[PDB]
């Protein structure tokens, strides 16, 4: 016998059925299921518990799904891809609720507003951040930056759009001003993913310089906004948009890695807590289950790995 | 509520001990043991089970008097003098004593002769039993020492694990108090807006 | 052993008087940080400097008219 930490059917589960590089993966905020997609364009849904049966599979993108996020109430899945389109998928219906056909190049990342009216921030190879409101065909905001933007998130109040890209500097756009109120400078190479802490105080940002830097995005900060730097993971010649994510208790951080290892760092000490093997290619996206200590990792190897971790 | 954790509160010095007890001394100088602290324990009946005889014997040594002793001069048995030989009873009492000692010495000889056969064996056997008790007692002593030590282990492993949370929460609390107070000064200073708003409204 | 047990519990309970005062005084000090925003007595001693020791001079006996133990039984 051995210790157990979750309702998983086994301490590690291997989920198989994707037909191409899995670029993105996310849990439902209610903890019931998870959704994953990538170069094979289908979006696969998996239950977190029991047999983890692939209970649904949405199709419709005409391109790789680069990024994929649940809305906070779990009633809709936002997804975006190389078909220049953001789509919102209704969970109960399984159907495209909206199709924001207004980007002019590949959409690299997407993030729905955490609360209030549902807004969808998106960043694209056209260089623009756009915020789309479900109620209008036209975007609410278009923030033209000069160079291709690869990652985006709102702040927690959903009134600043944070983005990064080929220029390595993160922009922070203030949605009442329509100006960059400040920039976060420090990455040596292009950003591959940005993720917002549950409390909203901090963001992490992954970059092809093989570091994750934690930034303080609170309105007042008494000095430097760079909180700390994590290292250990690696980005290879495939130049995938390796994502990053927060533990729901914020004690731990993850980032994708090209070295096959699933990395977890402790937020306070910056020590690597897990460096789990088992993938056979780039671990493109990593996420934590919102209620229970379970790790998701999605590989370029077409495999999804679910497993327990001791979140002590 | 006492909440000391001596494996975490390690700073406690002898100089602190003297100062701490001096404070309780300035209190216990002003607060005295008037309460019956022993109400959770029975009052002892020191004379439980004792007989009327044993009470008087306790009261003798309680008043610190020596115990009675047997007179043993009967073994030496002085002869009577010329002024006591007229008492026929006092002569018989000498002879009857001399007869009694003759048999005590006979039984002593029989005991000693049997003791010469078997004392060496029985004393050796006695030691062999007594040795076993000592080793078995030292086994019990060693076994209980480790158990006391194990309790110190489980205490340190608890207090140190809690000591990290205390140190994080303390360091977190002090960092926010200074940061939050700083913001209170900023939000006052940014009410310079009320100044510019007036001047811009007059324009 | 019963003498020493009473004294230690006393000394323990006497120390708890000190813990109680300082703990609340620490708590009030931390509460400030947690919310920080930008003569007859002497004549009484004089009278005490006789009456706590003097009053044998007049209280020489209990009153004679005070109830006996057999009388108050009829209350």
């Amino acid at each position: 016998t051995a210790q157990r930490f979750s309702n998983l059917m086994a301490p590690t589960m291997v989920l198989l059925g994707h037909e191409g590089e899995i670029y993105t993966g996310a849990f439902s905020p209610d903890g019931t299921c998870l959704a994953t997609s990538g170069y094979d364009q289908k979006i696969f849904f998996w239950n977190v518990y029991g047999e983890c049966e692939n209970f649904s599979t949405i199709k419709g993108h005409s391109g790789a799904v680069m990024d994929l996020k649940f809305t906070t109430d779990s009633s809709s899945l936002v997804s975006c891809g190389t078909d220049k389109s953001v789509r919102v998928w209704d969970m109960e219906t399984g159907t495209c609720a909206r199709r924001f056909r207004t980007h002019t190049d590949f959409v690299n990342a997407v993030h729905p507003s955490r609360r209030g009216v549902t807004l969808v921030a998106s960043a694209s190879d056209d260089g623009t951040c756009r915020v789309h409101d479900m109620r209008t065909k036209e975007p609410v905001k278009t923030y033209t930056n000069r160079y291709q933007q690869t990652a985006v998130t709102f702040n927690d109040s959903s009134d600043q759009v944070i983005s990064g890209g080929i220029d390595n500097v993160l922009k922070v756009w203030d949605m009442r001003r329509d100006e960059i109120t400040y920039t976060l400078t420090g990455h040596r190479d292009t950003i591959t993913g940005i993720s917002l802490s549950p409390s909203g105080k901090f963001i992490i940002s992954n970059s092809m310089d093989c570091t994750v830097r934690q930034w303080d995005i609170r309105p007042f900060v008494p000095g430097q906004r760079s909180v700390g730097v994590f290292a250990g993971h690696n980005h290879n010649f495939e130049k995938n948009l390796l994502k990053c994510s927060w533990s729901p208790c914020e004690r731990f951080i993850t980032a994708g890695s090209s070295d096959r290892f699933l990395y977890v760092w402790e937020t306070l000490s910056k020590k690597i807590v897990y460096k789990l093997p088992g993938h056979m290619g780039s671990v493109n996206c990593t996420d934590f289950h919102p209620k229970e200590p379970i790790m998701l990792s999605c590989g370029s190897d077409k495999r999804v790995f679910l497993g327990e971790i001791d979140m002590s | 509520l006492v909440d000391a954790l001596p494996y975490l509160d390690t700073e406690y010095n002898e100089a602190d001990r003297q100062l701490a007890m001096k404070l309780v001394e300035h209190e216990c100088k002003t607060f005295r043991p008037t309460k019956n602290y022993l109400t959770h324990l029975p009052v002892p009946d020191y004379d439980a089970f004792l007989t009327k005889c044993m009470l008087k014997e306790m009261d003798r040594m309680k008043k610190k008097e020596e115990m009675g002793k047997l007179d043993m001069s009967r073994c030496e048995l002085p002869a009577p003098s010329a002024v006591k030989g007229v008492d026929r009873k006092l002569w018989a009492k000498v002879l009857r004593n001399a007869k009694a000692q003759n048999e005590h010495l006979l039984m002593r000889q029989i005991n000693l002769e049997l003791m010469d056969e078997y004392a060496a064996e029985s004393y050796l056997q006695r030691n062999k039993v007594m040795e076993d008790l000592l080793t078995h007692a030292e086994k019990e002593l060693r076994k209980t020492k480790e158990a006391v030590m194990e309790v110190h282990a489980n205490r340190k492993m608890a207090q140190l694990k809690a000591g990290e949370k205390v140190k994080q929460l303390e360091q977190s609390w002090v960092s926010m108090v200074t940061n939050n107070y700083r913001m209170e000064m900023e939000n006052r200073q940014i009410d310079s807006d009320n100044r510019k708003q007036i001047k811009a409204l007059k324009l | 052993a019963r003498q020493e047990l009473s004294h230690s519990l006393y000394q323990h309970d006497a120390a708890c008087r000190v813990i109680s005062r300082l703990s609340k005084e620490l708590t009030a000090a931390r509460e400030a940080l947690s919310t920080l925003k930008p003569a007859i007595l002497a004549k009484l001693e004089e009278k005490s400097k006789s009456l706590t020791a003097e009053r044998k001079q007049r209280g020489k006996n209990l009153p004679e008219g005070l109830a006996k133990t057999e009388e108050l039984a009829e209350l």
């Binding site: 609170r218 | 609390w173 108090v177 | -």
Partner: peptide, 30 residues
């Protein structure tokens, strides 16, 4: 430990209130 977590959490909620103010204030200075 329980008391310190309340002391921390009192400042955590105090901090959010002060920064909702600071954003509201600085967005009025602008």
């Amino acid at each position: 430990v329980g008391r310190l977590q309340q002391e921390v959490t009192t400042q955590e909620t105090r901090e959010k209130d002060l920064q909702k103010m600071y954003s509201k204030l600085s967005n009025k200075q602008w």
